[model samples]
Target chain A: RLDKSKVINSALELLNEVGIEGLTTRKLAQKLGVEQPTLYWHVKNKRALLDALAVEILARHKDYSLPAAGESWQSFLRNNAMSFRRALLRYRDGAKVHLGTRPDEKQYDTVETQLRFMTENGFSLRDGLYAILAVIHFTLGAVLEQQEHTAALENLPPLLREALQIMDSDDGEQAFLHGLESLIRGFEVQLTAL
Target chain B: LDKSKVINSALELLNEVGIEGLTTRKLAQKLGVEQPTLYWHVKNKRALLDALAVEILARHKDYSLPAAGESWQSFLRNNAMSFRRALLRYRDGAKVHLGTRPDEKQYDTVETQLRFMTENGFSLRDGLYAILAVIHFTLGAVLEQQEHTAALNLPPLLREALQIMDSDDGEQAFLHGLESLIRGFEVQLTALLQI
Candidate 1:
């Protein structure tokens, strides 16, 4: 535990430098002026290192609170989704880092806030289950796609270009908010039926 | 021209070799041709995969939207299922599809979907966003299924939440999200018309 924070800090630094693809424990050890085994003694492996990084990601944010009380669940969740995307966009391959880690919510009691908001707003516990996962996947998927969007769109043929323009266009932030509104509205309907 | 033949061979190679392993030289060798010959038809690696994406999406035509007589719900549901099937067809199929910019051929499928939404009730803008939402969600869902990490142990409650979604080989969660999105649009469309 002597160098726990140091390890996590250096890992985040390495993540920024080499990206998730180029980062390796050995490289990190070299950067930290330590033996590879010393790094392993601190953490298990690459996956463990990333899991730690994911949590470290959340810990670094001072305002990491979930939705506030009295706000409608729709706005609450939508706001949270927007912020989550910002966090994911902070580092290269950030989504891949998160995909491998299960975010522990007990730290800030934020998990309690989400479930309370959902259950009070007519969502069954089961409904809350599908609801949260739906938004999480949607955001992660969108960010992952957005990260690669420009490169993919670089050499498009003319018709497809027109199609996106006519359909809705490529304003990633606007498109993201639009889809989020639809998802939250979808949940509202789900509760109404129930 | 043997263009269709080259496209088919590249697709076969895609299934066998995977996105990273795939290259024009390998593709040309597999087809018993020179790299320059592939360049004649495909232009480059990205264009070649764009062709493959279009072909995979051709399956989408078989999964049509609901007819004019049917509910919009059916239209949205069919769109989700169809896109999901198309994404799951190959190894990293979603990756391949996401990487390609849709061509004219793919535009036909998108145009039909957008019209289905707008004609039903949504404004053209809402229709477009809804379709994009569905595509994004499906891509995300499929990626979660395909590339989830084996490690990263979860705490109990979070694990329970994930388990609840394990209803039907990933289909249940996908549809659960899709239905939420459709109903979401449904509410907005109704509200828009009323006001």
Candidate 2:
């Protein structure tokens, strides 16, 4: 009789502690003071658990996922990208959690609303969807690398070392912002041509 | 005894079995060698995968460098397309690249690219970000394309979006997105550096 919400919240906490690889149903069941069978009732398997976790990660933290009234499409997109990146960065291997999951049925209305907003703002539905998805794919790729290990650059050639040093210096945030801006600007360009 | 030969066989096995199902034992069997023989070249599965990632790039990642007189935009676009093609060549191809560190063999190539961009009027930082942004975007795009999605009940607009995603025209969408990123970088370069 465990609440699904409570179970998911506990799972997120476990994720933060143990990471994607270290998390398991056995460990989660132990953390919840329940048997494996009980935990299984909530999430059929690790894959199912991860799918739910990915959605919940977005649901809990994406404040600007929906545009405000009269909000310009560009502004909404920038805000949404920032919000999505931050949320994925909150948990350990958070971006990895999002890697293969699809949008939950619960998110249908939100997706419809977002697509409608874009179409109303002069984007074809396909173009708007591409813009939105491109941003998402970029964000996931950025965060996935952001959370991974940096390779050691010692004993490398001078120019290569310098390039690697510049890349390693900023801790990914600056690059992410730059990339995000480029993506949004690109979408704007596409919109103007249409 | 040959690392390259072992890697090639492993890649074939990878295409057949995918990342999750790929195993050294299976790879060794494919090579007609015992597991210990395979282990001699690669310490374990992780090492094999890292080598495979490097080989995947080395074997198929042509067009990484700009030809003489090629514009930065053209180079980025071509390089990205080549990379995407390389990743798409294998099963779970993009997955092979995700999270793998850059190989040592790529240093000279990347340095040449960076230098080329700087000579063409980009600041080193801007050039690096431009290159990296394209890569991240491509990786995200490929990762999504490679993974299977579950079907779920959806409303009209959402269904249309999914249809577009799953349709034959998805590659066109990817191209459009790639063009947008390149154009965005051009905008940044012109505006920020006044080049």
Candidate 3:
């Protein structure tokens, strides 16, 4: 029997080459040197494969997702956001893969731990979940735009040209960081008011 | 010859078939035209989608421009709200907007928005990031809202979180997140630009 971990690892590598749209079960099985039925025994279909891939992407690269001992919620959030962004950026269309996927059963304990940590730091369970989700949605949005193909800018009007140039520059990282800081600060305001 | 009529029919088909199931063949059939004729107006599926995306914005996006003397914060909030509404108007509407190139029709509207922020004391770069961040956040929010996920056997906490997420409280949570992003931008503007 094929190991699930090995299958998922191979799938991630295939994802980099073909992207979400092109990654197919038939191709994946061929790459794995297995028959279609063998692959189907593992992942039921493309959607199932993507759901697993989304969870694994985070499990593999979101090293800072959990808070350290004596860590502040703000610091944990910032580090986690950076880690999540890196993980998604690692694979082509990674954010799209993560989009709309539910938390796998494997992630329940980890998510509960994070929520408990936030609640300990003076947040209601619901508000803590909201804050965490806001960070997630923001990061997903940023990475999606970052990975999108750029259009030709030469023929744009002067003002529009200038705007697109600035938008396309290395300032992308800065904008993400700036947005991250703002989100964290906003959470802080909420924390203080409570 | 009638690009507008063709596009309107395409939008109606979109609500029925969705983005993935939508195809040139089906669209042509709905319009009683040959695939060759459809190709004259839209060369391929990608071209058809691009046109559809632009029309989606042209038809539903009502609050792109700020009211006279609208405060930057208010403008951002309103713009985000309106943009979210537009993305929610159709099936897979957010997905349709994803990855589509900016059309020429949108150039003037975006230029005016940039000028509005500059007049309110934002450097062009800062203003652009603020606007883009809001857009990204809104897209992310709406994308999640549109896709439905089913539950399986789960632990109590995970199940609870999923339930809350799938509830009608989505709109309330979206509002909360929007406010957070807007406030974050305001915090940046006040500190960096000293406005």
Candidate 4:
């Protein structure tokens, strides 16, 4: 029997083919060989479909064990951030889909691990929360900007031209890493104060 | 119709209808001019969005450059906050600003941020990249906060965690991140000095 998972799996395939913006119900329904109303029985709306797709992508991420005892907190956070960015970069407009869709309640496990790791490393509970949010926001923000293929750069002024040149040369990953390192270093001070 | 008037009307429309709902036909209907008249002021949807950003960003012209005596921390922190404020002013503000050209008008602000970083010990190229990195980070954060909160329904423990965050105000969360980045850079400065 056709079920919700069937709808979700088909939508994921269509997402890669058409990209985020183009993954409409009409197209998805046709792709699934179902009428549009029948498609709605599994996924209610565009937002819900995107939400399912984001969850499905993250679900496929290779499972990693929690931080080992005595692991450098910097390595812990940096590895997570890099994994996140790479996941979003996998499909076209993947970052945009995740950016807009709120994941299910189970997603908090990821947040809890982050909080627990930082607290174990000497951050206060509140500070640990702040550290994770900062990293998540920074990672998502940096990746979204990187994925965008901008319209033009030929006539920009010197400063912006230089900024574009920097972003273009490095493809923004090095800068993303630097920002992550900076945030982690800042958390170290919080660690000390704890 | 005057061009300034057309751009001004578009900005107001954006605040009311948001990025997705906005259209040239609706804008012309509001401005009491034919749709063709809007074409005279704005080249197309892209130009209209850029114009909105340019006008909204004029708000930055009022910021005096950080004083010579200010600590780099204070300068960078304050600038990040101001940029966030501008991005949060209207519906989909961050997305719109991101879509448009980051034009020459922002030159002084970026220059000042880079200058503060260098004076505080960051190298020339590193300082410039750091400031731009912060901008990208802030835009993503604010866009998510404004647009995606409805999607995040959590269970009790994590829900409590979310509430704890919300209690302090979202801006505080953003500041925490910006400080983390700065502190991270400071640690790098120490390491670089050793070499």
DockQ for every model, please. 0.41, 0.52, 0.48, 0.50
Clashing pairs in 3: none
User: Relative to the unseen true structure, what is the C-alpha lDDT of residue B87 in candidate 2, on a scale of 0 to 100?
Assistant: 87
**How many residue pairs clash per model?**
2, 0, 0, 4
Error of 2 at B133 (Å): 0.6
Which pairs clash (backbone N, Cα, C closer than 3 Å) in model 4? A182-B184, A183-B180, A183-B181, A186-B184
Model 1 spans with C-alpha error above 4 angstroms: A1-43, A61-65, A104-109, A154-163, A166-170, B1-49, B59-61, B64-68, B149-156, B165-168
> At residue B99, what lDDT does model 3 achieve?
68
- Which of the two, 1 or 4, has more lDDT? 1
lDDT of 3 by residue, A5-93 (tens): 76788889888887776677888888888987787677876678889999989988777778889999999888988899998888888
Docking class of 1: acceptable
TM-scores for all candidates: the values are 0.79, 0.87, 0.89, 0.85
Q: Considering lDDT, which of the candidate structures 1 and 3 is the better prediction for this target?
A: 3
**Which candidate tops lDDT?**
2
lDDT of 4 by residue, B28-147 (tens): 998988877678787676677777777766764244357779876666666678778877777777766755645566666666666566667777667766776677778777877876
User: Which runs in model 4 stand beyond 4 Å of their true positions?
Assistant: A13-23, A30-35, A61-65, A68-70, A100-111, A149-162, B32-37, B60-64, B112-116, B150-159, B166-168, B190-195
Ranking by TM-score: 3, 2, 4, 1
Docking class of 2: medium
What would the per-residue lDDT of candidate 1 be over residues A1-194, giving only the tens digit for each residue?
Answer: 33877888888888888766557888888888988888877787777788888777756652444666577788877887888778877776676677635555434246655665677777876788678778877887787777656545555534344546653444377778888988998888777778
- Tell how far residue A184 is off in model 4, in angstroms: 0.6
- lDDT at position A101, candidate 1: 56
Indicate the residue-level lDDT of B59 in model 2.
88
How many Å off is the CA of B156 in candidate 1?
5.8
